Symmetry: D2
Subunit: 261 residues, 4 copies
C-alpha cells in the first residue's frame, strides 16, 4: 500500500532509503508521505521518535518499522543488510501488528494543550527551585522538591526512566511510571523516593507551589511553558502499531541492548 | 456466616479478639476456624501474613480483614477503636470484595514443590557465592552473581522490594517484579541492574551454575532447599480477596505509611 | 573586634540583627562590613552561603557564625533564643576556630576564571546533550553522557551531593567527591556509576566533546559559560574558619538534620 | 632476601610458581615461608586476601605482590607473561613501597577478639531480623533495621562496598566507609541511607537491641558469633605495604577493572 521513508540524513541512511525506494518500485507499493500506511525510519531511535511525532495524528492507520544504521536502536530493530528482505516481506504483507501503550500529557493555563509521548514526559523548573504538589486521583500525595520528575511509557522505561533508577516493564502492561530527579529528603522535606507505576485510568496531576514557569519535555522536544496551572498525566487511549515480521521479544531486545549483542 | 479471628498473642490483641467474639455472639455469626468465610487478623502485617498462609487452600472462599494493634500495618487497615463498627458492618454484610494478585513459586529437584506468596519470594546462597542463570520465557537473559534475588507481588512492592530499590505498583496490575540484592558488575560480570516487571503468563526461571543448595524464602518462612534443579516464578491464577467497608485507596495507604499519617 | 551581620531580610531576621547590634554596642565590638573579623549570618543556609561569598577574599581573616531563624540550617548552628548568650561569649572571645576544606573550580576559555565553593560545583549542558571526557591527573578515565556532574566539598556532601547518592564525609578529611546525574549506560556507553572521592592535590579535568557551552553553578550561582575549553576541579588550599563556642559534632549535626531533632 | 609464593592451586598457577622459584634460585633469594620479607600471590584477589591473612602478624616486615592468572584482580596487578621481569627486578630490589590503610574490628562478649580486614567487615543476623543501634564516638546516631551493614577500607571500596552503592575512595585517604544493606524506611523506622565516610580515630560501635547472635565476616571468612555485646570499627594503626616496580595509578586500576581494559 502507501508507504514513506524518513532518513537520519547522513550519506549512509539516504542511500539506503534510495535503494529501498527503488526496490519498492517493483511492487504495488506507492510512495506517499501525506497519508502513508507504512512508515519506515532509517537512522537511530531519535529518527524513529521524529517519525512517530510527524504522524501522531494517524496512529490508528500506520504501522511503524525501524532500521538502525549505527548503534542498535531500541525501536529500530532491523539491520541495513536485511533491508532487501524487508522490502520483500513488506511488499507481500501478511505481517502481524504489535501495539505499545502511550502517555497523554495535558497542560492547563489561565486554556489547554495535550501531547503524546512514546518514551516519556518530564518537568523541570525554569531556573529557580522546582517545587510541585503531586495529586493522585484528586488526593494530595506529596510535595516534591528536587530537580524534576519523569513520567514514562512501558517502552520508555529503557530510556531516561532507566537512568533515574526506574524499573523496566514489558509493553503489554498498560501503565505509566513516575521517577524522581534528585529529590531532597530531610526532617522537613519528604518524598516517596521509589518509582511509582500507575494503571490505566489513574490521573497524576502536578500543581505549582510558587513559580508557575516550567520546562516541559515530550520525548525529544523541550519547551518552556509560562503561566502553567496544572500538568496532567494518564495512559493514553491511543496506541502505536509496529509491523513485526518475526519474533523479536522485548526481553531479548533488552538483553541485546544492555547485557551484550 | 462463618468467621475466625487470629491474634498476635499479646494481651492487647487477645482481649480485642475476645471482645469481638462476644460482639459477634449477638448476630447470626458462627465461629469456625476450619472452614471460615471471614478471617480477621489482629496484630501487624506478620500476623496477617500468617493468617493468609494458614488458609491458603481456601483463598477462593475467604475474604480477609486486618486490624493493626500497633504500628500501622499495610494489610491491616483497621484501628482497634473501630472494632465495634467492624463487627456491626461485618455482621450485616453487603460489603464489597477486592482482589490482589499473588506469586507462584515452583521448586524442582532430582520432584516438585509449589508455594504461594503474598509479599514476595527470595533466593540466596546456602553459604558460598550465589551464582544463577536467569531464563525468561526459555531465553537466557543474564548470569546473576550477588547476594540474591527477590520476586514481589504488587502489594509486596512496598515491603522487601521497596528496600531494594524496586518500584511501587498498584495492585490492579497483574504483574510480578524482580529486584537484585547487591550484584557485582565489572568488565567480566554483567547484570541488568534495573528492576524488571513481568506480566501474567511470563515465566522466570532460575538455574544453578555451581552450587545446588539455596535458602528460599516465601514471605516470612525461610527454608534451605537441597539438590535444587530450578526455581520458577509466575503470576498465580489465584487471588486473595479483602472485605472492604469503605474507600481506602492504595496510594493513600502508601501515603499514610511512608509520607506521614 | 570588628564584626558584621547579614540578614535574610524578613521581619524576623532584621529585628534579631538589630537586637544583636544593640547588644554588641555594650562592648568593645565595632561594626564594620568592609573588613570584619567576625561575620554573623541570620536566616538559613542560603543566607550563610551568601555571607561566605561576600567575603571570600578575606577567608583567612574571618570566622563565620550562623543563626537559623527557620528550618535548622546545616551551617547556621544557633537558635534565635540563644542570641544573647552568643553576643556575650563572642564579646568576651576566647572561642575555638574550626576549619573546613573548600573546592577550587577553574574554567578555561579561548583566558581563565577561578571560583571557590563551600557546598559544590556542578556542570550541565546549555540545552542539547551533555557529553564530557573525564581526565584524572592527565589520564582519560571515562566519557560521561548524562544530565551533568557534581563536585562536592566534605561539608557539601549533605546537600546536593546527598540527593544524588553520594556519601557523607566528615569535614576533617581534605577531599572532594564527584557524583553523576542520570548517566546513560548500555552496551555502547559506560561510566563508573559510583561516586568518586579524591584526595588533596588530585586534579579532575572535564573536557568538551562536541558542544562547548555549559551551565556551571558554584553553590547558589548558576551562569552559562561560552567557548569553554576545560573545567578543572581540585581541593583548595584555602579553608573557611568557624567560631565554635561548644561541641556540636558533625555526626550529631547530621543526626539532627536527617534522623530527627 | 627471604620470599615465599602462594598459589591458587590450579595447574596454571603452580607451574608459574615453580618457574618463578627456579628463576629465583639464580640470585641471593632464599625461600622462607615462616619469616618472608616478600610474599608473592599467584591467582586472583581471593588468593591475595588469603596471603595477607596468613601473614597479618608481620605486616610491618612484608611487602606484597600479586600476579593474576585469570580475571584481572584488583590487588594482583601483574600478568603471568611478565613474571620473569618480575623475578629480575625483584631480585635486584630498589623498588618503592606503597601503603594502604586497614580496618580494625573488635568484638566484645560476656572477653574480646580483634580482626584486621583488607577489603571490609560485615554484620548480618543469625536468622531472625537484624536490628542494631549505631553509636558514633559514643553518641547514638541511629537504629538500623535491615539485612546488615558493611564497613570498608579505601582499597575495599571497589569490592562489596561498591555493589551496595558506596563511593570509591583513593587509598591515600585514611578512612573507613559504612554502607547499608536493604534498610527499611517508613514513618516509624529511619536510617540515614547514605554511605558514611569516617576519618582516623573515629570509633563506630554497633550494639544489639534484641538478638545477641550475628554472622560477622572479615574479608572472605564468615563466622557466627554468639553472646555478642558490641562490635567496634576503627581505622587500624597498621598498614599493608605493596612492592611497586612502576606507576600503576589507582584510578587507572579502577578504569581497567570497570570501564574497560
Ligand atoms: N539528549 C539525548 C542524549 S542520549 O544520549 O540520551 N540519546 C538517546 C540514547 O537513548 C537511546 N534510546 C532512546 C532514544 C532516543 C532519542 N533521544 C535523542 C534525540 O531525540 O535525538 C531522546 C531521548 O533521550 C532520552 N534521554 C534524555 N536524557 C537522558 C539521560 N540522562 N539518560 C538516558 N536517556 C536520556 C529520553 O528518553 C529521550 O526520549 N529511546 C530508547 C528506549 N525507549 N529504550 C532504550 N534506549 C533508548 C538511543 O538509542 C540513544 O542511545
Ligand atoms: N524480617 C522482618 C523484619 S521487618 O522489619 O522487615 N518487619 C516487617 C515490616 O514490614 C512491614 N510490611 C510487611 C510485613 C511483614 C512481616 N514480616 C515479618 C514477619 O513475618 O514476622 C515479613 C516481611 O518482612 C519483609 N522484609 C524482610 N526483610 C526486609 C528488609 N530488609 N527490608 C524491608 N522489608 C523486609 C518481607 O517483605 C517479608 O515478607 N508487609 C508489607 C507490605 N506489603 N507493604 C509495606 N510494609 C509491609 C511490616 O508492617 C513491618 O513494619
Ligand atoms: N535550589 C535550592 C533549593 S533547595 O531546596 O535545595 N534549598 C537548600 C536546602 O538544602 C539545605 N542545605 C544547604 C543549602 C543551601 C542553599 N541553597 C539555596 C539558596 O542558595 O538559596 C543552595 C544549595 O541547594 C542545594 N541543592 C540544589 N539542588 C538540590 C537538589 N536537587 N537536592 C538537594 N539540594 C539541592 C545545593 O547544595 C546548593 O548549594 N547546604 C546544605 C549542606 N551543606 N548540608 C545540608 N543541607 C544543606 C538548606 O538548609 C535547604 O534546606
Ligand atoms: N563471595 C565472593 C563472590 S565474588 O563474585 O564477589 N568474588 C570476588 C570478586 O571481587 C573481586 N574483588 C575482590 C575480591 C575477592 C575475593 N572474594 C572471594 C574469595 O575470598 O574467595 C571475597 C570478597 O568478595 C567480595 N564480595 C562478597 N559479596 C559480594 C557482592 N555481593 N558483591 C561484590 N563483591 C562481593 C567482598 O569484598 C569479599 O572481600 N576484592 C576486590 C577489590 N578490593 N576491588 C575490586 N574487586 C575486588 C575479585 O577480583 C572477584 O572478581
Amino acid at each position: 500500500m502507501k508507504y514513506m521513508i524518513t532518513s537520519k540524513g547522513d550519506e549512509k541512511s539516504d542511500l539506503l532509503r534510495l535503494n529501498m525506494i527503488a526496490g519498492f518500485g517493483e511492487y504495488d507499493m506507492e510512495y506517499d508521505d501525506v497519508e502513508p500506511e507504512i512508515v519506515i525510519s532509517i537512522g537511530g531511535d531519535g529518527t524513529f521518535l521524529s517519525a512517530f511525532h510527524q504522524y501522531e495524528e494517524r496512529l490508528d492507520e500506520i504501522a511503524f518499522i525501524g532500521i538502525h544504521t549505527g548503534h542498535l536502536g531500541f525501536y529500530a530493530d532491523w539491520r541495513p543488510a536485511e533491508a532487501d528482505k524487508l522490502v520483500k516481506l513488506l511488499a507481500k504483507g501478511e505481517y502481524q501488528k504489535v501495539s505499545y501503550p502511550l502517555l497523554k500529557t495535558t497542560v492547563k493555563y489561565g486554556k489547554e494543550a495535550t501531547y503524546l509521548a512514546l518514551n516519556e514526559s518530564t518537568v523541570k523548573s525554569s531556573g529557580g527551585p522546582f517545587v510541585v504538589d503531586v495529586v493522585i486521583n484528586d488526593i494530595h500525595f506529596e510535595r516534591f522538591r528536587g530537580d524534576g520528575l519523569c513520567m514514562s511509557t512501558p517502552s520508555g522505561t529503557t530510556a531516561y526512566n532507566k537512568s533515574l533508577g526506574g524499573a523496566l516493564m514489558h509493553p503489554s502492561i498498560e501503565a505509566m511510571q513516575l521517577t524522581e530527579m534528585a529529590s531532597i529528603n530531610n526532617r522537613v522535606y519528604r518524598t516517596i523516593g521509589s518509582p511509582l507505576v500507575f494503571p490505566k485510568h489513574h490521573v497524576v496531576s502536578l500543581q505549582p507551589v510558587n513559580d508557575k514557569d516550567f520546562q516541559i519535555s515530550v520525548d525529544h522536544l523541550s519547551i518552556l511553558h509560562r503561566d502553567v496551572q496544572e500538568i496532567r498525566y494518564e495512559v493514553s487511549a491511543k496506541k502505536i502499531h509496529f509491523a513485526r515480521f518475526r519474533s523479536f521479544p522485548f526481553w531479548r531486545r533488552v538483553h541485546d541492548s544492555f547485557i551484550e549483542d
